[PDB]
Amino acid sequence: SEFILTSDKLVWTYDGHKLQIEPWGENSLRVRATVAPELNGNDWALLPAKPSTKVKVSEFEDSARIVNGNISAVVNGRGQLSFYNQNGKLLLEEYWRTRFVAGQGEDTSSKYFSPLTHEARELKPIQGGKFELRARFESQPDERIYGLGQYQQPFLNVKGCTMELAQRNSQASVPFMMSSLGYGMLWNNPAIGEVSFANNVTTWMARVTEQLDYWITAADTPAEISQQYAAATGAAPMLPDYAAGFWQCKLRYRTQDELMEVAREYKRRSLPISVIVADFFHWPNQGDWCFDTREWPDPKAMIDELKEMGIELMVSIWPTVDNRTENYKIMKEKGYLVKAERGVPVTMTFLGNTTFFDATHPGARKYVWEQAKKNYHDLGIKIFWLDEAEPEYSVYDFENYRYHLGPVLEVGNIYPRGYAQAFYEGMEEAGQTEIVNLLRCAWAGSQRYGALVWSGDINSTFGALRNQLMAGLNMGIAGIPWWTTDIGGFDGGDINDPAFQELLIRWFQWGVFCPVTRLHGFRQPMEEPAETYRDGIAQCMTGAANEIWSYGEDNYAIMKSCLELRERLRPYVMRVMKAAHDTGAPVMRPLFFDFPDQAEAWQIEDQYMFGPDILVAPVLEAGQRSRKVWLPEGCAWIDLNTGARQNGGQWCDCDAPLEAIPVFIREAAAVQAELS
Amino acid sequence: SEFILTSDKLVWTYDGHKLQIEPWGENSLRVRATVAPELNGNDWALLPAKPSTKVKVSEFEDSARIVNGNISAVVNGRGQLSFYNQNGKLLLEEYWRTRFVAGQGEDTSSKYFSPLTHEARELKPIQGGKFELRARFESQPDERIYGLGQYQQPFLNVKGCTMELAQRNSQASVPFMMSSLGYGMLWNNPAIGEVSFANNVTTWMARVTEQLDYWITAADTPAEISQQYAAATGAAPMLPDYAAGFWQCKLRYRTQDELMEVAREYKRRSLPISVIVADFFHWPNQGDWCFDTREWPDPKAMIDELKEMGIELMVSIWPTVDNRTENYKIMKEKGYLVKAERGVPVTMTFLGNTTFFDATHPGARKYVWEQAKKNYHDLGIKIFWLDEAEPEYSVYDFENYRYHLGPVLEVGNIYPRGYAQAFYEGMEEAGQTEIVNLLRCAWAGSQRYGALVWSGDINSTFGALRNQLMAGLNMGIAGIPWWTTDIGGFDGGDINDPAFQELLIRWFQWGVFCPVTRLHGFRQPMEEPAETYRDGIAQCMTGAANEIWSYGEDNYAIMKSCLELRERLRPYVMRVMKAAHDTGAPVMRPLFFDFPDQAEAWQIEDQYMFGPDILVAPVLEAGQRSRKVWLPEGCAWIDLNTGARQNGGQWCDCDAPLEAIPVFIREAAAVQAELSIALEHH
Amino acid sequence: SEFILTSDKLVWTYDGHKLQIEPWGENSLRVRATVAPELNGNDWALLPAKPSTKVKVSEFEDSARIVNGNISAVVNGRGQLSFYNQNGKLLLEEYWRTRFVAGQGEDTSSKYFSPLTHEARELKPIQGGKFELRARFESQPDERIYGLGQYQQPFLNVKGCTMELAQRNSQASVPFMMSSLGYGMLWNNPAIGEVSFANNVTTWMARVTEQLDYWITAADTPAEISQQYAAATGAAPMLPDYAAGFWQCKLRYRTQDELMEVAREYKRRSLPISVIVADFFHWPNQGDWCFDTREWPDPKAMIDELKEMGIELMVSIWPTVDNRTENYKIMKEKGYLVKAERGVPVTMTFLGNTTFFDATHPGARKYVWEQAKKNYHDLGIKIFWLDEAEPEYSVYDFENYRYHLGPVLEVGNIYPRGYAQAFYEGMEEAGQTEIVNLLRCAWAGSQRYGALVWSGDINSTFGALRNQLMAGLNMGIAGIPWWTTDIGGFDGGDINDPAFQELLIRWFQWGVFCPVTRLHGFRQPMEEPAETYRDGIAQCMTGAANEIWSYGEDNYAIMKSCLELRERLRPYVMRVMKAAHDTGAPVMRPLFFDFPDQAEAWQIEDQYMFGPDILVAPVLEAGQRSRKVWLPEGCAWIDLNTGARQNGGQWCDCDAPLEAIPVFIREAAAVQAELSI
Ligand SMILES: O[C@@H]1[C@@H](O)[C@@H](O)OC[C@H]1O
16 A cells, blocks of 8 residues: 655555546546556546646545545545545545455454455456446435436436436436535546446446546535536537527428428517527438438528528438448548447448448548538538437447447447537637537537537427426536427327327426427327338438417417517526526526525425526426425515515415416516516 | 266266267267266257167276277277277377376376367356367378368368358358368367368367267278268258259349240250249349249249240249348247347348348248248249358358357357258158259258258359369268359359450369359349339349350350250269269269279369269369379270270370360260260271 | 558558558568557567668559568558569468458459458457457468477478467467568567468467557578568577586475585586576575575575586576565555456466566566565576466466456567566666576567577477477577577486486487577476475475486486587587577578578478588487488588588488487588587
């Protein structure tokens, strides 16, 4: 057992195991461990640290200690690590269960003494290869845990839950967590694996990796934790103005004329509309990244008319490359495609045999961007819908695929970050500022590449709506402030079904108080293409209409008023977006973000704060016409729908007619005057 | 160390390793070993053995011995095994290199003493799984080794060569070997692996297996070894008479009219023709197994007219099932398809995303047969072209596929046998006798299912032709008497190119003296289909013409006379085919099969015997117009082309003009009279 | 398909596959290939290249070419590679069997066209990991192949043979090959694997690796190839004088008194003796690396007396560290030990549970050297016996062990080079020149660390003797000029058995004309130790006596004249050793090394050249009293035993009584003058 101590770095070593702890921004430490000869150069999501002035490394008895502001790490003579805040309170301690460790007998008076033989930092060698990593920490009975990204589950507090560290359609692993004990932690490792916050032990796992790497931060409030995390992995940029308006989309406007007729109908009725969207398979083949002129005769003319109307066009980008295309040939020559380890060299079979471009290859990123630049960006398109961002393998056999940066088991989760980066860096180099692209997935730090994330191809049910509320809140905690959904859900909504129409209204009303308000879906009754194939290429179907006038007049009036409300909200949304850029605060936040001293704020999972001044209580059940709403203590609250004043620190039974959900405004906040 | 002996079985055991040796037919032993609790019930290619009456099991000193006729196995107290014949000559010896084995020190006076620590029977456990098997035997300085199946290499004798135990297009692993030391050995294990007959050590390897299993046989002559092997794995059936005639094929007759135009034109020129062939993609989609009526409007009328003409139709069967078909849906419901272990559930991407039917699944065999029965056999088609029989994965990642009988790594090589079995059993059940189907691949015992094997999609060169001669002869030694090639090779022959025309003629001349005489290929210039797609299904191209009149008048005359010569040979062919059925002897044989006592017979690799009465000496180089020919001792030889008589036991410098290759007939054999060999005085 | 060409580098790429060919010494090229983003920085055995005189890179048609003196590489538009010499003759061509390659249909007129789908450079991805590599080349009909290291097999020409690329007791993978077609090739990759020189195809295989890496060289003669190889991987140093004399050893002299009594007896009988050896388990425990004072009370006094007698002491070093020792604790603290991937953390169980020191770890190398320096070298010991150099795992499950530089499957074969390096660098740093240590194993480049390799614990038979001849010759071709055996073999020789005694004499006679003349073995009847354990530590047995007088008076007379003959040869041996250092030529050479233009020189495997002036024809069978000997053309030959002159270019029946083997001297060679004076 040997310490190697300098003024700003703690290293411990035994039997080739190196544990290295150092400052990494104010109130924060980076922890690394390896049994290779040295640590490698992989920083993954962590940006260069602003130097800490206050770091102090000490030695006492058989231990060593490193303090950086409000966090300290203690490593004992057996190489066992625990973390404390500035008040000396335990934040986090490693989980050891051994009789012998670091060449020494374990202390029989400690819960660490056990014949079971579990190490806190298990680097298990893979034969012929690298390491299978498990990092174990003690559970705590009072610990509540948030963040981790976007999971399709009805839990805000994820203590007791196990989350797969993998990317699938409707899931995003963004592995930053925030604990109610007063710390946050980033698992700075893109390997396929799992995080289990089980009641008996916390275990982080990486299937294949070179080394342990995490970042831990301490502060007295969630807001400071979020700020410290944003300094570690990058700030969201400033949201462009147009992104705060209404985004109109469906699966799918099949022709230029169809899309333009919708936009013209919005303008004919003087309705708000900021963005309109051309969904997938508007292209001749996958990997062409251009409009098919048979259905889109004059894209420039579409964009120019939309510009006259004050509307931005967003276009679908698929990362797939069909093997019959010219771009497949050239990308294959250059080595810019993902590779199958075994079997046919095909990663997806949706409407063609396609291979994904490799978003971890800097050359492939540039290539795909420059195709999109030439065919779309040069025409005046400045928003891209970066769909299939996981990427969506037809079969999620992660072991069977390899990227430029290594096997998908080792590096796979960073794909969506690279995909967003390709477009953000490309658009920035082309002279665009305030970039936003619609990404289906993300990793740690995706926020710095302007990633507006949505929750994918979920079903159209109230159960799904409930999951989306939890997922969006946890995404904000994981540092992804720009987040949204398909209003009404993606799959299964019949436009003539009264039950779906009720869900649509409830989801729309919530969508007004989401970071982006976006109508999209694949509505029934669907329509098969007239021709199944054209030039041997399978043709893509469409769903039914999905405009605010498509569901009758009663529903039209409700959604029209929703759009008018969203327009009145825009200055407040831009203020909250600037705050997200400035301070790393989410836009939609759990109650504890703004009221961390109040017990109820850490319990309630069906209410949230839309910025600091608006309390939102969505209706999450069919047929519900009232619900209980807890009003936080410390201010009075103004009912958005009645103008009535209510004192903080009480439960209210609130009216929730089909035409409105309960929403309260912080008294005397600037947004109060803006909304009436 | 412990022997468990009975009157007809030797078992040795130490530390869970069981070695079991027992008689398995006359002059033959089966050898099995495992570290599992017991031996499993897998017999693979071995048929039940006829009881051997005089089997003798003894123990002496610390050793044990089992004798069965001309072969004996000796196992010493360290479990080390060697084989001897009735004259006490060493046939085959296990390779051990250890200082400590079976709980005992190794003998320092033996070549077995070595710190290296190699076992002869290495069952290396796969973590969480079964075993990786290596069976090591000592090499022997003057051992020459034949058989093993069909490999694309210019070596008849494969001592010093390493052969992959896997099935790929143009390769067939049929793992029966015959040694010049006077034994034969079947590796009775369908696992993916390798056999290396290296000069320093012989190693058989199986990637995944439950147990070691081989069959070994001893006799004084090759013919006896071949007979004993056919008794162990099954006799070839009797060939139907039409199969000895001329088979006309190309890639591809696209329509009923095109095929019938060729058939009628053969009859109009009074040319011999016994089989005509409809190649692949005559169907609406892969897995439909029926004629596409747009190109083939009345299959019944086609078959009836061909029958009036004395011609059998053969049709292409592909084992692929495209995922848009009705049979895919049903076969998926029932579990009748091969499965990918990882990635997209697609085993081949040629003209569609297809999955192979599982030829190791009894239910799937029956399902595919009954489709072919309903759509082809009930109409009067008696011959099936079982193509892609390996099967031809787009990528040969054997580790990524699984069959009914287990992972491809453990059982993969038996697929072509099951594919043959599916059609043979079905046609037999339907009342057909004398069955022959054209298979691209085979395993040990494929011969019993009427498998006429051909050597696949080789290129059209003299290099290829040389490889095919070696491959065809080794297939015969491996117990596959019915074997042929694409005359001219498959890929790359332009019909207007003199260099290819030269090759076509030499290959055709050789083809006359192959077990089946079959013209096929994908000739240039190729023609793309008019429509690349139809109903979203990719359409299949065709090559150029490939009939005997398609290469100019001078070449037409040579091929015409080749066909006429083949017809005169038919009675002899049918006698030699009967001998293959009765004795297990190959049809095309190396010289050592008929003349085992003569040294030149074990050295010469560019001559062979076509039955016992015809010596063939093919021309295997462009521009060559004469070659040396060794005539075997013990008889006189009649030159087929001149009529001259030559004494056995000499090298002759033979004329070999474009119009004929050197062929010699055994004097006074019945075939001499049948060939009508004159000698005019001008 | 894309070429990236500069003045001295050819790169070809398709689908992330990068093939890079460049000069690496005169008449030589280095070939690397990877599917990773870039080539790594691993040079393994290749030393920095001297920049070449006339390197030319050019593109023509759809191909590219790189010429460096007498070798050239051609890469076509399908990425397929072949090598030619200055006369345009094909040396080596890649084996491809595909219908489609590098995005293009294959040529149907070529032997490369095949549906089998075998690539010449197969970098097969291991799931979650690196690559399984197969490099395939066409076999050639008259190609004869030599080198590869030390294998226990009766084949000099290894065409048709398959060799394991792994290190085991009695085997050494030193993967430089020399072909009769006029090239040599180093497989510059330490991975566990295999080389298959099959008649139908040549296949090199690595179980786990990051990239393809080989070095290829061309010259008109074997001598130039050997020289070019030595420039690439390092010259053998100059051998010290004492190493050419007689090395006396057995398993084992158990005490200081017992060793010294043998040394004194050799001097008392006026017999030559240059080195005497303390074998294993002279230490308190494995990993102590010091004399046990209970059996060795005054080591400094022993060394001083041997110095007075003109004798160097060599001591056994074992790379094992027993888990009860002080050094185990410290080396485990520092991470200087080899690791088991699974199961009990024990690599060997011989007389204790031990773990090997990690010879690929620079710190571990330094640690072990400094233990040996403090306890042996500082006392005046100048030669170490680096035994168990593979290292000798109790079970050779290479997948189950890991070194500093990675899994044993990826890097394992370089261990013995590291082991030699540890002592050579330390001894050189300590002020010693002309270093020689006795290594049981080697890899490519081991020669530069003064590695005298011996063929390990082989059995005592005539079969073994035949194998050793072949192995030693092939080790020389592989660039290991300092090579020897246990005279008599290691295991199974009973000193009272007349059959063994005959083998011993024939082996000794051959031993006179080996690069080093060294007597060693574990002779029967063996003797168990007095007590099985002392202080819980299992005690090591000894074999019977193994001195030249231990086998009766008639045998003593023969071995006595062998030693005297060896002393007369020492000036010649030292000249041949200097030539090895200057030119990379081996000491014991096959006939084709000195007579490459003669057909018989490439066929004969039971004769060899001991330097350029002595033709040796050992007796390799029991009871043989005469044998056939081919005399090379171009000079006359003097029979060493009779003095009779013989013209070159003929076969002779030579008398081979028990008292001599047929040896011939090149007429008028300086060694003829030295032997007759
Ligand atoms: O939202 C959908 C997206 O997730 C994918 O399936 O492509 C079509 C879109 O409508």
